């Protein structure tokens, strides 16, 4: 969808797959503020929308933390806390007509400064001059919205590039989209160091025998020690043996 | 009816302040677009300021936050108020509204003169001296190669105020006569003005628009031989 209808899509639970985004040499202008661009597996925001756009040529380098201009005037607004980020794409044949487009439309006319995260899709006249505009094209009666125009051309500024924006919610439920891999098999018989779901500890995985309810995950003994732990693979009890030790 | 008046004929000291003004005459300011542009005579004509619905500033890129531009819906005006004002600054200062897709500066204001203490676009005939009777052929090229319709033409008058010809060099301006016609593209784009008349003997400018600052031609006269 153009830049005038700006469409959404949110993300549901599911299991977030960020590790191929950068690693991809497709994108140019991955620039954004906020958290690290590398701890993406680490993050717990709520919620996340991708917004999309085909927005054409420097256009896009409006897209900051706060800006004025032709297109973040009255569409597509950033606001100071957009926490997430700004992925552009690269424009071709795919995306061209040897006649030109024509179905595509920006809004260049209207009265007051859009609000961040908000669309206004009612475009019949924008009223430039105080006489009737009762629905007839002509002086101080002017129709605000303009199709584009792209031709096969350099491609510096005057291709319809693809831009979508990925926000973030920072805290109004808990998240559902924390996933890390870690990629690590079991060991036993052998003093390790475990980090079994946020239990850090070290010590002997040996075979356990016990009759762990569905709903638990570790047990304790009298003095508040951890003495086994559910791998949640094969959904398997472990128990957990000290390290050798003593004196000479 | 549509009227531009200006009053900013006053001799300024060095380092002085001005203020300029551009009043409106029924169209309301608050919802259109504004556009400052520097004559400066003897050369091409240049970019100031714009002003979009709203109240956004936008500066050219030599001039940097020194000139400070504000509308008053109160008294429906466009003021412009001139800081300390340095060398070679002598012009003039048109205001005109603009709808730079749909007509590029369909009116303008009407002029002033401001002294001092004490894109790669190019027109490419020349004066081309010629009688009436025939056609002509004006030729405009750009470096960067605008697409499809980001280039207008205006015709000066000395004295007067700049008018538009043709907008976006496919369909020309309302009331202006159909002797006048556009082609070209790519690169270049050929004006052409058939059974020439008393009335048309004019500098004629080419501009371009939708890209970075707008950029006007250098300068093209009609004198006869």
């Known amino acids: 969808a153009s830049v005038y209808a700006w469409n959404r899509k949110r993300i549901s639970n599911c299991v977030a797959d960020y590790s191929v985004l950068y690693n991809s040499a497709s994108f140019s202008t991955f620039k954004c503020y906020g958290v690290s661009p590398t701890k993406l597996n680490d993050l717990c925001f709520t919620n996340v929308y991708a917004d999309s756009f085909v927005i054409r040529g420097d256009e896009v380098r409006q897209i900051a933390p706060g800006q004025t201009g032709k297109i973040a005037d009255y569409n597509y607004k950033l606001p100071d806390d957009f926490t997430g980020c700004v992925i552009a794409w690269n424009s071709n044949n795919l995306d061209s007509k040897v006649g030109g487009n024509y179905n595509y439309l920006y809004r260049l006319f209207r009265k007051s400064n859009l609000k961040p995260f908000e669309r206004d899709i009612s475009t019949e006249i924008y009223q430039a001059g105080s006489t009737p505009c009762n629905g007839v094209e002509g002086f101080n009666c002017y129709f605000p919205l303009q199709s584009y125009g792209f031709q096969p051309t350099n491609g510096v500024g005057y291709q319809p590039y693809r831009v979508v924006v990925l926000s973030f919610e920072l805290l109004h439920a808990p998240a559902t989209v924390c996933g890390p891999k870690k990629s690590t098999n079991l060991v036993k018989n052998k003093c390790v160091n475990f980090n079994f779901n946020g239990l850090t500890g070290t010590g002997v995985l040996t075979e356990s025998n016990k009759k762990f309810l569905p709903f638990q995950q570790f047990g304790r003994d009298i003095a508040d020690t951890t003495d086994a732990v559910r791998d949640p693979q094969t959904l398997e009890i472990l128990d957990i043996t000290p390290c050798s030790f003593g004196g000479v | 009816e549509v009227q531009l008046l200006q009053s900013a004929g006053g001799l300024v000291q060095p380092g002085g302040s001005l203020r300029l003004s551009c009043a409106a005459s029924g169209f309301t300011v608050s919802a259109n677009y504004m556009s400052w542009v520097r004559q400066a005579p003897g050369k091409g004509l240049e970019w100031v300021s714009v002003i979009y619905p709203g109240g956004s500033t936008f500066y050219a890129d030599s001039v940097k936050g020194r000139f400070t531009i504000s509308r008053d819906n109160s008294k429906n005006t466009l003021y412009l108020q001139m800081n300390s004002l340095r060398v070679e600054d002598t012009a003039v200062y048109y205001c005109a509204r603009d709808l730079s897709v749909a007509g590029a500066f369909d009116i303008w204001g009407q002029g002033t003169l401001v002294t001092v203490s004490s894109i790669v676009l190019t027109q490419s005939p020349g004066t081309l001296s010629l009688s009436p009777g025939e056609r002509a052929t004006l030729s405009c090229r750009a470096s960067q190669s605008v697409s499809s319709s980001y280039l207008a033409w205006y015709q000066q008058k000395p004295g007067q105020a700049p008018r538009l010809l043709i907008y976006?060099?496919?369909s020309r301006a309302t009331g202006i006569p159909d002797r006048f016609s556009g082609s070209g593209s790519g690169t270049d784009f050929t004006l052409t003005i058939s059974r020439l008349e008393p009335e048309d003997f004019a500098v004629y400018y080419c501009?371009?628009?939708?890209?970075?600052?707008?950029?006007f031609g250098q300068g093209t006269k009609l004198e006869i031989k």
């Open positions: 501009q371009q628009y939708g890209s970075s600052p707008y950029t």
């Open positions: 976006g060099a496919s």
